Symmetry: D2
Subunit: 122 residues, 4 copies
């Protein structure tokens, strides 16, 4: 599913995920968040299963954005872990962890958890 | 903290995380899990905050491993999201999400969550 | 929102959440999972914010089910943490953690994470 | 493990978890957080597996605190999901989800995730 994953994806917040899937399992591209302490595009990288099961299962994948670019630095990183599901209404269904750099006293509150669903439309 | 992060790290399970931190925010290297459906080294990639706060806060980072190599394919991916804390007993404190490729009927059970602490010793 | 929360709720899997909200912040009732190692109803208990903000924010709440009843014992417990949002299309938006009893060797894989959205219809 | 679980527990932050395990699977008691927007004791309730496996596995359990008492209201709830491990150095190993009541615009950032380990000492 190199073909299936590569391209522009959109989540329920209106964020834009632009990815290229490599034959080797690499994910590279850019992320633009519609929310939070974010402006414009941020580098992403990640990995995907380049030889998924042929029993109708999804394709496992994940990627990271560190929220620093030329405009802003939110001193934080998000990882998305999920699976690509192909077909007429292709989706990437994810859960994510957003960690901030914190002092040791605040480290208990360093990490948000959430879920994003990406589609090829909207 | 390019210097601080780059090198060999070990978690509480005895897994080995070998990383290079790029001046640009890139993380590249290899991961070897002491547990699960895993053998030998797997590619990782990720990102880190290359200009962290100077108020004693940690450095945010994350990375992904897709559990396919020349030996095995576990049809799964783990993302670690966390922060690097420098000093005499440097640590990377993480939480992680492990997603399997699943059928739609099993997708509710696709994702494990856990936490790993990495040190430069053991 | 004692009135708003009390009643029968349904999630996207077709599970049924039957709850009573107490004036004191208590949640009591029963849960029936449409999936997994589950049959019929299981006891639940939990808590909710009985004096929520009046600025349009949701109402925080959570509850637990241990997956033992007279029929089955899945040696596991799920906690849902979320917020109630009132109005024409009332919802309870949750994330959940499902922990199994494990041996120490398997404890890294003890916990699933997911998300459920409950509505008053279907 | 009604006997094993019932009593006073302490986590790595110095919080105090006071619980009674019922023969029926109920957990009742009080929680006092050493951190966050919290003062004094808060009601908790939860559930545990009252007939765990006899193969050396832990005992699954969970509980909820809504962060309202006579002193403060943090408009939030935490759920802990985990397992009790008996013996000389008994532990309750948990992961937790802390949800705030939010506006719909902030709901993506409503939930923290973390992990607490409880012991009978300190």
């Amino acid at each position: 599913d190199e073909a299936g994953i590569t391209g522009t994806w959109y989540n329920q917040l209106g964020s834009t995920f632009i990815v290229t899937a490599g034959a080797d399992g690499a994910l590279t591209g850019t992320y633009e968040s519609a929310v939070g302490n974010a402006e414009s595009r941020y580098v992403l990288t990640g990995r995907y299963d380049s030889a998924p099961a042929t029993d109708g299962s999804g394709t496992a994948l994940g990627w990271t954005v560190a929220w620093k670019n030329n405009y802003r630095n939110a001193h934080s990183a998000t990882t998305w872990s999920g699976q690509y599901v192909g077909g007429a209404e292709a989706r990437i269904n994810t859960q994510w962890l957003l960690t901030s750099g914190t002092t040791e006293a605040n480290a208990w509150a360093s990490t948000y958890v959430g879920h994003d669903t990406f589609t090829k439309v909207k």
